[PDB]
């Protein structure tokens, strides 16, 4: 190979507040001509140890290679290290000015950012999605050679090196570190494996946090654990549960057959549908309400809904607030799950889809899914940066449905025997809480608040809890409180849980 590729600088990552998230750093890279090398036998030890290996090996490399016009000595050292090396004066070594990334929030917003390879391409998260934007174009120099390897003359500077571009993400540091401390402090306390949290911003589709364990520090480029550089967030897909039962609730009240004062009756607590038996936790209930199904988690209530209002209607519901769809965010083998769907719906796939057991989403899906209930039924596409023109969003559900589903969720956390570990002190906060059994479980939250202008959507998932309770009302419901409370007060979210009288 003839002429040198000069390394691009690789673009800035900063999050919406321009907190510098990756960070080019200047590494020095030494290669040399063993023809030359091969001439300076006596300052070869030197050279060795001056990069930890070994003094015979190091002998036995060179004299393999001593053919070869170009081999490198070592990759990524710090330039002073570099500078060291240099200071020996040994012929036949040269020296490259390269870049390798440091991440100033660490594990903090690991998964998000993600890392790069050797060669300084992205590897992971943005890094890897905007791996073109942040890359930039690597230059080129023309060397002329005697034969040996002597820098003689540089003429013209053929192709100048263009620096990638900086790119300010959607998340909020300030929110990524409650999240991040937050859901760190869940999984210790519940003796978790795994976990994710979304915060998203409902009014522009912003990925605010988004956060999982286990982590890693990217700046540690040894030992990495592949589970812990998971980001299960966009890449593990789960059955929602009882986290979907407010999108069948949309169908119900969209389909004119319901209102939320209607009566079901839930008794015995189960429900016989041919082969299959829809089971309910508590099964002290006869009527129950539209909004006391959501309290009561009701799979036989939402279930019967179903049956008369149709799969269908459900299906189209969930399919339009995007689970089990595609983001649209092109990220790094992100997963896309799964929605059943059906020409004719057997009644026993109609209840499972209606209570969340017939399908696979991810934290991410159903974030947004709550941001689209949140903003009054209209889904804004979801983005990881900064959104400063926010595009058109769609309504996905009628503004009327939303706003009273909402207050249903806002019911499900307020009222008697509701979700109390999900109240945010000094807001009126909504939601509904999730618990699949996978024995071995999984506890989920998703919610929305502030109820009279909701701001943020939050979805809370912790993977196999192994404490007593291991409910989502009881596991991940205080997780959503704590972040909430937080989250909101770092935006200067006004409280709204004021007097009337
Ligand atoms: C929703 O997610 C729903 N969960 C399920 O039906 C699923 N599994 O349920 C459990 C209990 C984990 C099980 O072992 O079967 C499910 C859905 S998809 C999938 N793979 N698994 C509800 C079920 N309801 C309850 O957990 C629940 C608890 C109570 C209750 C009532 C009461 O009066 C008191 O005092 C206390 N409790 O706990 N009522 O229902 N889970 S959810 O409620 O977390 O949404």
């Known amino acids: 190979v003839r002429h040198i590729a000069i390394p691009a ?27 030359e090398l091969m001439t300076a036998k006596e300052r070869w030890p030197q050279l060795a140890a001056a990069l930890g290996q070994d003094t015979k090996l190091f002998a036995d490399r060179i004299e393999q290679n001593a053919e070869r016009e170009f081999i490198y000595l070592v990759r990524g050292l710090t ?167 407010p999108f069948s609730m949309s169908a119900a009240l969209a389909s004119g057959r319901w209102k939320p004062s209607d009566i079901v009756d839930v008794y015995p607590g189960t429900l016989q549908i041919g082969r299959y038996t829809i089971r309910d936790v508590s099964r002290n209930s006869r009527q129950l309400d539209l909004t006391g199904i959501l309290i009561k988690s009701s799979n036989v209530g939402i ?35 799964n929605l059943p769907n059906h020409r004719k719906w057997p009644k026993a796939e109609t209840a499972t889809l209606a209570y969340g057991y017939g399908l696979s989403v991810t934290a991410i899906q159903l974030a947004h899914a709550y941001a689209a209930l949140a903003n009054d039924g209209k889904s804004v596409p979801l983005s990881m940066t900064r959104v400063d023109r926010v595009p058109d969003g769609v309504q996905v559900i009628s503004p009327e449905v939303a706003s009273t589903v909402q207050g249903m969720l806002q019911q499900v956390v307020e009222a008697q025997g509701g979700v109390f570990r999900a109240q945010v002190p000094g807001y009126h906060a909504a939601g509904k809480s999730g618990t699949a059994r996978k024995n071995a479980y999984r506890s989920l939250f998703a919610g929305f608040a502030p109820a009279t202008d909701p701001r943020i959507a939050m979805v809370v998932v912790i993977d196999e809890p192994s404490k007593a309770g291991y409910f989502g009302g009881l596991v991940s419901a205080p997780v959503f409180s704590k972040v909430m409370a937080g989250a909101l007060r770092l935006m200067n979210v006004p409280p709204d849980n004021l007097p009337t009288a």
């Open 9 to 35: 600088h690789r673009g800035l990552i900063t999050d919406r507040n321009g907190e510098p998230l990756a960070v080019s750093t200047p590494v020095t890279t030494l290669w040399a001509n063993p023809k």
């Open 79 to 245: 330039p002073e290290q570099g500078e060291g090396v240099i200071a020996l004066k040994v012929p036949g070594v040269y020296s490259i000015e390269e870049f390798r990334r440091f991440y100033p929030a660490g594990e903090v917003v690991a998964h998000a950012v993600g890392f790069t390879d050797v060669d300084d391409r992205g590897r992971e998260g943005i890094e890897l999605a905007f791996d073109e934007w942040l890359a930039g174009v690597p230059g080129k120099r023309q060397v002329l050679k005697d034969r040996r390897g002597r820098v003689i003359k540089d003429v013209q500077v053929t192709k100048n090196a263009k620096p990638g571009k900086t790119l300010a993400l959607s998340i909020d540091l300030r929110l990524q570190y409650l999240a991040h401390r937050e859901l760190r402090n869940a999984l210790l306390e519940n003796g978790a494996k795994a976990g994710s949290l979304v915060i998203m911003d409902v009014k522009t589709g912003e990925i605010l946090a988004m956060t999982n364990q286990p982590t890693y520090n990217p700046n540690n480029r040894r030992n990495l654990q592949p589970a812990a550089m998971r980001n299960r967030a966009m890449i593990d897909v789960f059955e929602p549960g009882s986290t979907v039962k």
């Open 303 to 337: 279930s019967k809904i179903a049956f008369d209002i149709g799969a269908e209607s459900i299906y189209s519901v969930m399919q339009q607030v995007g689970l089990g769809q595609d983001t649209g965010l092109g990220f790094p083998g992100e997963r896309v799950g």
